[PDB]
Design a protein around this ligand. Structure first.
Ligand SMILES: *C(=O)[C@@H](NC(=O)Cc1cccs1)[C@@H]1N=C(C(=O)O)C(=C)CS1
Ligand SMILES: *C(=O)[C@@H](NC(=O)Cc1cccs1)[C@@H]1N=C(C(=O)O)C(=C)CS1
Lengths: 268, 268
């Protein structure tokens, strides 16, 4: 049921000047679209969705975790911390930091939560616990964005990203209240309007998390999409390019998402 | 007279897993072999040959320059300074530093001479003065070895390297005594036995300068070769590869030199 209908991913990535990786699953039938789906691509900020899921998993064994206040110093603020910088003088709860990391890609919030989980190895351990053997986080922000060609640090594959997203949003990896909170955070993301969402009709529900490394044409997005009247779709689109100064493209991510939905026979 | 005889450079670079750039000139007939010859490749230590030629050019207007003693501190010693480290407590002359830079690829010696010439811009100005509009040096050692894909800093092309080498060793860019000293330094190089020299019969004279960046499979060599009974050949072989951890190959440089000589119809 993989690639029943061929789509012109190769021409798209040639126009882009780099590499595109796509996996998409129709959770009703099991049909899939797959292009470079087992290659490694840099995660960039897309690790933050899985980080919020790990926080939610911990909250199942710590009833008070999400409402715990967290105070931090100015040394915790790194570039692109649009929400956490406004609460420097007050602190924020664990849930508020998780929402900021997911919905505004707040960099400081995600570094604070990563510390709470035991660092890059602690998030990797959570991903192993749900059966993902591909994901690896190795460094902190902003260092994890280097996107060096051939470097496996801070990478995963489109397929493993999609499979783990399905387990966390639609499967049983989280208990039902935590699962719906994860979905709600993804649905409220503000940074993805020009990526997968640009290929999705306005009357369908959709949640996503973006990543943008800033070098090597490297950017990405993953999403759960609920077309009306049929089962949800889960998909991941990752990009990279050979030269450090190559620019990323939001339009290419949107176009690859359109091809994936067309390959699954979903009318849009 | 370019590429009268095709050679399998593409299969060689595919076996290597990267890109190879070759220019070779028969100075008797003007026939040339050219493959990726106008692409930019990192210079790495190959800039040091041109640096020694620039020192020689200056010596034409300063009779005492070559025998001027130079004393330096331990802070001038950078990794891979095998000759200059043995004269830390005594100093070395300008000529001795030039010989060390050319023949042992001594890193500290080349940084001291670059300072004497007014830095990377001063060496670039010398190359412009002999008609080379392609060469650029931008940084000091060891920083100039980063070999980042797409970065034009500290690069030239195989063709421009060969054309400038011809002007300096066989043409009129240097006065006759300085020209022969440059040739003698190149003939005494010790670091190139597994590169162009490995394709050259033992009974032919040959001088060369190597470069090895340490990343991105990036290494190179250029040479003047005097086959007996015919005019000299000038050639340059540069390599790079897409991933930071890709290894360079001396054997590929030797093999590309063999193809270049075969393409020119020189029996070896
Ligand atoms: C995550 O990807 C993170 N990116 C960086 O911190 C590196 C850069 C900083 C400025 C430009 S690139 C944040 N996430 C997003 C995203 O979710 O796409 C960004 C747009 C940049 S900041
Ligand atoms: C020049 O290429 C210079 N290379 C470096 O300093 C970077 C590296 C250090 C250790 C391994 S690579 C010197 N030149 C040569 C050469 O002429 O080929 C080398 C073999 C390394 S040191």
């Amino acid at each position: 049921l993989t690639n029943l209908v061929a789509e012109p991913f190769a021409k798209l990535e040639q126009d882009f000047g780099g590499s595109i990786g796509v996996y998409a699953m129709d959770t009703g039938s099991g049909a899939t679209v797959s292009y470079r789906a087992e290659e490694r691509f840099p995660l960039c900020s897309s690790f933050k969705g899985f980080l919020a899921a790990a926080v939610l998993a911990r909250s199942q064994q710590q009833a008070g975790l999400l409402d715990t206040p967290i105070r931090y110093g100015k040394n915790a603020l790194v570039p692109w911390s649009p929400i956490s910088e406004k609460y420097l003088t007050t602190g924020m709860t664990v849930a508020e930091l998780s929402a900021a990391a997911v919905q505004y890609s707040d960099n400081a919030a995600a570094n604070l939560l990563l510390k709470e989980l035991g660092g890059p190895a602690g998030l990797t351990a959570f991903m192993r616990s749900i059966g993902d053997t591909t994901f690896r986080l190795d460094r902190w922000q902003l260092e994890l964005n280097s996107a060096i060609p051939g470097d496996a640090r801070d990478t995963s594959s489109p397929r493993a990203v999609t499979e783990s997203l399905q387990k966390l949003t639609l499967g049983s990896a989280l208990a039902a209240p935590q699962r719906q909170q994860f979905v709600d955070w993804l649905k409220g993301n503000t940074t993805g309007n020009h990526r997968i969402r640009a290929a999705v009709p306005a009357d369908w529900a959709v949640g996503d998390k973006t990543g943008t490394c800033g070098v090597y044409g490297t950017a990405n997005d993953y999403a759960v999409v609920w077309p009306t009247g049929r089962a949800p779709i889960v998909l991941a689109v990752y990009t990279r390019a050979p030269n450090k100064d190559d620019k990323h493209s939001e339009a290419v991510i949107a176009a690859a998402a359109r091809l994936a939905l067309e390959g699954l026979g979903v009318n849009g």
